[PDB]
Design a protein around this ligand. Structure first.
Ligand code: ZN
Lengths: 55, 72, 68, 142, 100, 141, 141, 12, 165, 105
RNA sequence: GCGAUAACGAACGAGACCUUAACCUACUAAAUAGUGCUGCUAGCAUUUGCUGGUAUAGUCACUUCUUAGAGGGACUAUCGAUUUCAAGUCGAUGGAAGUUUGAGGCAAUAACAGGUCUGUGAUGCCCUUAGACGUUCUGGGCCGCACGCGCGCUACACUGACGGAGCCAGCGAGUAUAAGCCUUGGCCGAGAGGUCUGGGAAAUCUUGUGAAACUCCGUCGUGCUGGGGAUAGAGCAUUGUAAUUGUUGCUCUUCAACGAGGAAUUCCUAGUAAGCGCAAGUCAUCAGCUUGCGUUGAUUACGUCCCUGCCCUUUGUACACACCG
């Protein structure tokens, strides 16, 4: 049947199992502390989250 | 084999050692290796035996530097 | 090197102009006085002002100096 | 101590199955055979109850006999099967610590069975390429 | 008499110190004993990421830090008082929790 | 409490806390004599708080140290510095300030580290290079 | 004034305790001490192969003696070295677990170590005396 | 630009 | 759900970032200046500062109630678990977000770039700012992009005081 | 270095501290040249530091592929440089530096 | 900055600033830190001592050590000399601190047709949009190997390999109806690893992360040899739906180049280089990679414009796409 084949491959334990919260890209994600933001999106949102540059 | 040292001890090694080792200011291991053409572990066992003997007395001990002086 | 910038120098000049009798020739007493006189917002800047003021005072004793 | 040998200068340069020099400890001497390493040589000398401090020439007929027996009959002298090259065989499923030239013969047998079925590992062996999936773009110009 | 524990964390030092002094004042209008405050070592959440949104240029990195400060105070007091002692201190930026 | 002082001593990150209370000449390292800790060479650095001044300053005092951190050489240096500080503080609050002045003169005439702790720290590692100052190799074309 | 394990160099202490415990002959030396290897990150068996287990047992027993409530994992990490990983860089790897377990269990049956509360093995009341008396002989020399 | 993605041929 | 303190604080920051993104994308044409959530025993207090407070609370408060429902059934909190309010900005010319939104709105209407830039600068100075700067970048009047700067007053660039002022 | 001091004392009759001090003060070349190179006269501290540097080098490259251990090579180098004889790696370099440097004047 | 002055008064940058490292036995408090005392104990010795153990009730004391907030502390302080006596500079004494105290974050105006449309539900235009250049499924490729180049790791041995013994840091990270996190203890197997329990949402447990270099005592003994660990066969596991093109881990065997590197060229001034590991990111599995951290810890300057460049003035110019003219 159609619905049995669609999206059947298991998307856990991989790059395709995770995505950015903001833009849903699979590349360069930051998973530390459950951030789940790709590194560019985190560079944009760090001030909002509470991450600041000191040294 | 450029070095070509002694591997086992015979009567003449015994005689040479006991005619020449008292006449050395210093022996460590390589002293005997150099001016006896003897091998390393053989030099070591010979030095220990003669250190129980009254021909060489240790000056200081180390697991990689034997130091012996004249019997006097 | 340690060359004093314009902020500390002008601060010291105005301290000497406006409170000369109070200022002394001692760096510690000058520290406690410059804490009371001016409202520097940093310990380091306060110290630099007070010390350069002490140096200026120790120069002024040997005759007037042009600028104050 | 030291042995004061005379009339028995051990310089027997021909030895067990391979022209092993008799001026070195027996442990690393058995390694000279094609099929024995330092680990296996040490274990075989331990089971042969031969002290690991005398050169190979010091050894005599009974010791050589025992060394041969261990080397060709490992599943008789309390040698664990996990210690032997050429474990459970692709013929009878048995353990065979293969020694000299029959070792290369078994190697050719493996090559022949791979090439006969036309397997990728056998094909890369036939060409002469690395079979363990290593990159050969750059680090193969030797 | 119970073993009520108050533990509170924040990212801002000054607000946390003000609210801790506030709970001290609130327990000081009564006479609740004050074993703390005790100061846990601060947590520094460090993220090092590449500045460039691509892969070109000199290799430069940003070191973002989030700082977390935790404090504990042990209050021995009847279970009624600590409820108000805590729920009247809702100063923003400080998350406070109560455990026996 | 009868007669006790508490001093520390530091090096790279190695920290030694001393416990010099009144005793019988007992000088120990974590519960072992000064005559051995781990090494065989650097024992004389911790012998220095003794040989410079003589053993008689320790007649009635017993010293304990809880060195923790750093490495072997760092611990040895921290221990001997802490021993010197503890002896000086004992002479300060119990024995004699003139005595401690003579002792610290001996130390400072031998080694300023005995009283003045070394204030050196590993400079942080910077991106773009393996070390604090070392850099990744540059490849022009 | 007596003497204990802390007053002696480690080398000779473990030497004497190992040789003595070998002299007794009651320690259950495993039947595999000739085949097996000390560590997965090791390349050769112990050279003094007929009595190495007694050396290891003496060292382990002293290691509990100086501490309290240690386990098999801690000793495995203590006796693990630096693997020679080939072209790749070095790394710490844990030692053999079966060897250490059998060693501590044999030390149990000789009554030298006891099963401590909530994990680990302390030293037995009689083991303290055994080690202390065996240490007192070396220091008399 | 990715060799200008072309037309594609059909076998079915 | 047991989040750690590290994870709790990080998730709180991400929640604030998402909520600000949402209010920017929903209250764009009301001079949205910012939001601040007050964590309390039951009702986290949400305040949204906008230039046009009547843009929200449109027709008896429709807007805020439907935004409240939006947030509660997106983030799955108690319907009585939050509270949303709105306070007018005390000085719009002192708000960078308000000035930027007004500038954007003027550009879409069709007003020329120079006049809108100077309008923003003079509004900021009339508010009481010690300095103000507007930079407009892109294809300005032509197919070749350029950046046009407008400055009035004073402006610091390096050091901590930028983060403060 | 402690095995050194020991081995020199077993061989020498003087104090090995004196042996090394004399070797170092006699292993510092006096004429060396800077750019042809205009030969100039070397400073004290520099003569000292090349003395120690050459002694350690000579020992190090004698100990490469040699059964004679590192402290033993050091001892022989120190003995040969202590006597002033051209049998030490430093003393032969002390020959070459002046031998070249004189031509450079 | 002192000063000079057709200027005068300003502004940004620099400096200040902020973060961090170093000092405080001087405030404030630690049952998630420690030191003691006092109980209940053990081995030695019996002098009441030396080593330890346990008691979050002993309804014990305290804050040197550790933690963190409030502050203090250097300002070149004092002194000796040179300088337009001016801004400074060199030495000493004091000191934790005397290069801007060390280390960083931040960082002007003007620009580049520098990179990114492959971070983006950031985008104009062009293209395509149902046999789709949307999306999804199976399988393969990005790893393919006469060959050239860059960043690296391991090495070429005795200042060394091993084998036992000593077992010394610091920065961090961690989950619960998982699809499972750090994992301690107990028990099996040589090991990889397996299993039964326990602790930890964490200064509480993992963890003192007993790291590795390093120290000692032994075997080897100058040689491609016990140096070096490629390539290759057999076997045991682990992750994963799937290990063949070996994922990785472990055992036996095979034992290749390489004996210090040409013309060239990179990095570096003190707790720095070099050595050595460790943690975190990528992560189902996989670190020879980066980002940090500590352990051991140097030789040589502390100058110069020869080379490569940079800044300021004068000067020439037929250059301005600016001498790659
Ligand atoms: Zn993103």
């Amino acid at each position: 049947a159609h619905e049995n084949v669609w999206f059947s491959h298991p998307r856990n334990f991989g790059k395709g199992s995770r995505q950015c919260r903001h833009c849903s890209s699979h590349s360069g994600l930051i998973r530390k502390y459950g951030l789940d933001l790709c590194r560019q999106c985190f560079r944009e949102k760090a001030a909002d989250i509470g991450f600041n540059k000191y040294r | 084999d450029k070095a070509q040292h002694i591997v086992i001890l015979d009567q003449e090694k015994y005689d040479r050692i006991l005619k020449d080792v008292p006449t050395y200011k210093y022996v460590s291991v390589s002293v005997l290796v150099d001016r006896l053409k003897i091998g390393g572990s053989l030099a070591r066992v010979a030095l220990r035996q003669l250190e129980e003997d009254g021909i060489i007395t240790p000056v200081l001990k180390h697991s990689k530097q034997a130091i012996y002086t004249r019997a006097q | 090197g340690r060359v004093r910038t314009k902020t500390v120098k002008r601060a010291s000049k105005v301290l000497i102009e406006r409170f000369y009798p109070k200022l002394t020739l001692d760096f510690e007493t000058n520290k406690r006085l410059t804490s009371e006189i001016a409202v520097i917002q940093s310990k380091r800047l306060r110290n630099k002002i007070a010390g350069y003021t002490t140096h200026l005072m120790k120069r002024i004793q040997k005759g007037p100096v042009r600028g104050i | 101590l030291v042995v004061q040998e005379q009339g028995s200068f051990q310089h027997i340069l021909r030895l067990l199955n391979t022209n092993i020099d008799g001026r070195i400890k027996i442990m690393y001497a058995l390694t000279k055979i094609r099929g024995v390493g330092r680990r296996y040589a040490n274990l075989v000398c331990k089971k042969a109850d031969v002290e690991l401090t005398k050169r190979a020439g010091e050894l005599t007929q009974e010791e050589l006999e025992r060394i041969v027996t261990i080397m060709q009959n490992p599943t008789n002298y309390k040698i664990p099967a996990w210690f032997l090259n050429r474990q459970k065989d692709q013929v009878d499923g048995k353990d065979y610590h293969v020694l000299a030239n029959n070792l290369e013969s078994k190697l050719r047998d493996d090559l022949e069975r791979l090439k006969k079925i036309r397997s990728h590992r056998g094909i890369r062996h036939f060409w002469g390429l690395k079979v363990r999936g290593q990159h050969t773009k750059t680090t193969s110009r030797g | 008499i119970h073993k009520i524990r108050i533990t509170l964390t924040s990212t801002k030092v000054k607000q946390l110190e003000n609210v801790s002094a506030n709970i001290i004042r609130n327990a000081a209008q009564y006479n609740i004993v004050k074993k703390g405050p005790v100061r846990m070592p601060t947590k520094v959440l460090k993220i090092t990421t590449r500045k460039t949104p691509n892969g070109e240029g000199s290799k430069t990195w940003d070191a973002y830090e989030m700082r977390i400060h935790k404090r504990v105070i042990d209050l021995q007091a009847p279970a009624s008082t600590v409820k108000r002692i805590t729920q009247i201190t809702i100063e923003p930026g400080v998350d406070v929790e109560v455990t026996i | 409490s009868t007669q006790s002082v508490q001093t520390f001593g530091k090096k790279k990150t190695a920290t030694a806390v001393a416990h010099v209370k009144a005793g019988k000449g007992l000088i120990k390292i974590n519960g072992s004599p000064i005559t051995l800790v781990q090494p065989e060479i650097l024992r004389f650095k911790v012998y220095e708080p003794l040989t410079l001044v003589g053993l008689d300053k320790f007649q009635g005092i017993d010293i304990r140290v809880k060195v923790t951190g750093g490495g072997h050489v760092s611990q040895v240096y921290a221990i001997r510095q802490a021993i010197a500080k503890g002896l000086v503080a004992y002479h300060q609050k119990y024995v004699d300030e003139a005595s401690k002045n003579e002792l610290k003169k001996i130390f400072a005439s031998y080694d300023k580290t005995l009283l003045v702790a070394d204030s050196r720290r590993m400079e942080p590692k910077k991106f773009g290079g393996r070390g604090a100052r070392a850099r990744f190799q540059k490849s022009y074309r | 004034p007596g003497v204990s394990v802390r007053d002696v160099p480690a080398q000779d202490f473990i030497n004497a305790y190992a040789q003595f415990l070998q002299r007794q002959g009651k320690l259950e030396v495993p039947g595999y001490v000739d085949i097996v290897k000390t560590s997965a990150g090791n390349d050769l068996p112990p050279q003094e192969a007929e009595t190495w287990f007694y050396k290891r047992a003496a060292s382990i027993a002293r290691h509990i003696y100086l501490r309290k409530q240690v386990g098999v994992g801690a000793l495995n990490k203590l006796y693990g070295g630096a693997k020679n990983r080939g072209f790749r860089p070095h790394k710490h790897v844990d030692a053999s677990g079966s060897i250490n377990r059998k060693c501590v269990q044999a030390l149990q049956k000789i009554g030298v170590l006891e099963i401590s509360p909530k994990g680990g093995r302390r030293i037995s009341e009689n083991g303290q005396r055994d080690l202390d008396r065996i240490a007192a002989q070396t220091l008399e020399e | 630009g990715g060799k200008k993605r072309k037309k594609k041929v059909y076998t079915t | 759900a047991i989040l750690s303190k590290k994870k709790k604080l990080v998730a709180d920051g991400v929640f604030y970032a998402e909520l600000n993104e949402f209010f920017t994308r929903e209250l764009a044409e009301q001079g949205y200046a910012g939001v601040e959530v007050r964590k309390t025993p039951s009702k986290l207090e949400v305040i949204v500062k906008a230039s046009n407070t009547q843009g929200v609370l449109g027709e008896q408060g429709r807007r805020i109630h439907e935004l409240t429902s939006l947030i509660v059934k997106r983030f799955k909190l108690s319907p009585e678990g939050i509270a949303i309010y709105a306070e007018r900005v005390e000085e719009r010319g002192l708000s960078a977000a308000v000035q930027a939104e007004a500038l954007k709105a003027k550009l879409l209407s069709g007003l020329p770039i120079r006049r809108a830039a100077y309008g923003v600068l003079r509004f900021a100075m009339g508010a009481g700012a010690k300095g103000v700067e507007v930079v407009i970048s892109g294809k300005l009047r032509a197919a070749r992009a350029k950046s046009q700067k407008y400055a009035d007053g004073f402006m610091i660039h390096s050091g901590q005081p930028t983060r403060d002022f | 270095v402690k095995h050194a001091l020991e081995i020199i004392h077993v061989l020498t009759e003087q104090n090995p501290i004196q042996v090394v001090v004399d070797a170092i003060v006699n292993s510092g070349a006096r004429e060396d040249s800077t750019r042809r190179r205009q030969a100039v006269d070397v400073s004290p501290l520099r003569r000292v530091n090349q003395a120690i540097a050459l002694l350690t080098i000579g020992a190090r490259e004698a100990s490469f592929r040699n059964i004679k251990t590192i402290a033993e090579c050091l001892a022989e180098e120190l003995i040969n440089a202590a006597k002033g004889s051209s049998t030490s790696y430093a003393i032969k370099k002390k020959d070459e530096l002046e031998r070249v440097a004189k031509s450079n004047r």
